[PDB]
Amino acid sequence: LGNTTSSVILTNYMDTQYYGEIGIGTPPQTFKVVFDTGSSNVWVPSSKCSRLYTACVYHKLFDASDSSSYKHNGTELTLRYSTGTVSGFLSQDIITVGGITVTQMFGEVTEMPALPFMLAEFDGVVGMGFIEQAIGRVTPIFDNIISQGVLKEDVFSFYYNRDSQSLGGQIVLGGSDPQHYEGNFHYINLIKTGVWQIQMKGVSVGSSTLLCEDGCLALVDTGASYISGSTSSIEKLMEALGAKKRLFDYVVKCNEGPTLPDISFHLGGKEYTLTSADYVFQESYSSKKLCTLAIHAMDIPPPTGPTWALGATFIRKFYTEFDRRNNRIGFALAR
Ligand SMILES: CC(C)(C)OC(=O)N[C@@H]1CNC[C@H](C(=O)N(Cc2cccc(Cl)c2Cl)C2CC2)C1
Ligand SMILES: *[C@@H]1O[C@H](CO)[C@@H](O)[C@H](O)[C@H]1NC(C)=O
Numbered sequence: 246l247g248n249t250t251s252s253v254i255l256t257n258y259m260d261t262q263y264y265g266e267i268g269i270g271t272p273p274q275t276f277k278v279v280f281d282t283g284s285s286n287v288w289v290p291s292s293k294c295s296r297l298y299t300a301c302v303y304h305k306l307f308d309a310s311d312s313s314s315y316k317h318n319g320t321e322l323t324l325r326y327s328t329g330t331v332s333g334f335l336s337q338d339i340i341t342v343g344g345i346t347v348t349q350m351f352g353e354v355t356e357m358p359a360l361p362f363m364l365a366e367f368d369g370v371v372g373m374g375f376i377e378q379a380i381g382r383v384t385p386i387f388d389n390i391i392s393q394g395v396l397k398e399d400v401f402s403f404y405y406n407r408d409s410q411s412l413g414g415q416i417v418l419g420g421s422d423p424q425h426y427e428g429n430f431h432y433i434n435l436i437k438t439g440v441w442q443i444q445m446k447g448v449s450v451g452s453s454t455l456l457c458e459d460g461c462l463a464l465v466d467t468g469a470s471y472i473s474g475s476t477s478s479i480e481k482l483m484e485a486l487g488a489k490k491r492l493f494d495y496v497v498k499c500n501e502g503p504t505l506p507d508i509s510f511h512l513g514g515k516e517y518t519l520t521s522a523d524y525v526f527q528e529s530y531s532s533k534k535l536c537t538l539a540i541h542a543m544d545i546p547p548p549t550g551p552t553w554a555l556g557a558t559f560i561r562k563f564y565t566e567f568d569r570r571n572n573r574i575g576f577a578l579a580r
Contacts, residue, residue, distance in 0.1 A: 247393075290357055291354055332355060342371070349386055378549075436462070445512055470558075493541070
């Protein structure tokens with residue numbers, strides 16, 4: 246253990262995407278990336294991506310021919326995401342993340358489907374998960390940063406702000422920033438190592454524990470935009486809110502959004518409550534317009550799922566600390 250705590254400033258895009266900058270190669274090629282606790286691989290779009298993938302034409306591409314620090318690998322890599330899929334191959338190069346430089350193995354993506362990557366403001370993803378979830382058993386960037394013995398502590402923490410021209414968010418590698426949280430952290434120990442998943446002991450709509458009464462799983466996913474549950478759990482939840490299912494989202498009439506009940510998540514000791522201002526995209530107060538909720542269905546497949554996922558919707562209210570040393574997640578009220 247060292248005495249270094251570095252931070253990555255994040256950009257908040259529409260309260261759904263939070264991305265910072267990383268630099269790959271010599272000289273550095275910069276990419277906008279999402280720091281994802283629900284995955285463990287690093288990947289950026291490749292120059293080897295065909296121009297027929299319209300997503301590739303609209304994102305920064307890594308070119309190994311312009312990097313003197315590049316080391317070829319070539320092993321195939323397929324990443325099947327709950328939202329889509331990416332294929333490419335592995336490569337090793339020097340990666341800079343908040344003043345920390347690490348030699349890192351990552352995927353050069355050559356197949357990037359338009360839907361959903363034409364909606365991505367970010368170029369790629371920096372997986373903040375454990376080696377146990379890394380496709381091709383590639384050493385994750387945080388495990389490589391830990392190995393340097395440069396960090397003050399074996400933790401990293403997230404701050405995600407409400408959309409505004411202010412700070413979008415922040416990741417602190419090696420600690421937590423007290424300027425973005427109040428009170429003290431309440432920890433919840435991980436069920437098992439290998440996943441950033443904890444036990445949840447009930448989801449309540451208002452006063453009545455409407456779901457997860459006999460306990461259920463909660464994945465603390467910085468890479469997920471919304472709060473997610475199973476199709477059955479979300480169907481029951483939305484019926485309790487009066488929410489009408491559209492194709493991809495759930496909506497309410499804009500005028501009845503501020504009246505919607507509080508939603509609570511029973512984790513560790515505490516009840517983590519979100520008011521309707523925390524989960525409704527309150528775009529108007531019109532009885533003639535529809536307002537989307539920041540909760541959606543996601544049937545995650547085993548071993549990880551079925552599970553709930555506490556994404557950006559949760560992290561905006563609760564500043565989150567991911568402790569690798571003690572295999573726990575700490576929450577504090579964000580500020
Ligand atoms: C099986 C395994 C590979 C581990 O599963 C996962 O990695 N599962 C991922 C877990 N974390 C959320 C990930 C995600 O959905 N996106 C996509 C995304 C989010 C918001 C907006 C857009 Cl446009 C997109 Cl594309 C990645 C950027 C983080 C899926
Ligand atoms: C790619 O990386 C892995 C990392 O463990 C290494 O063992 C393997 O030999 C590499 N493959 C090639 C083709 O260089």
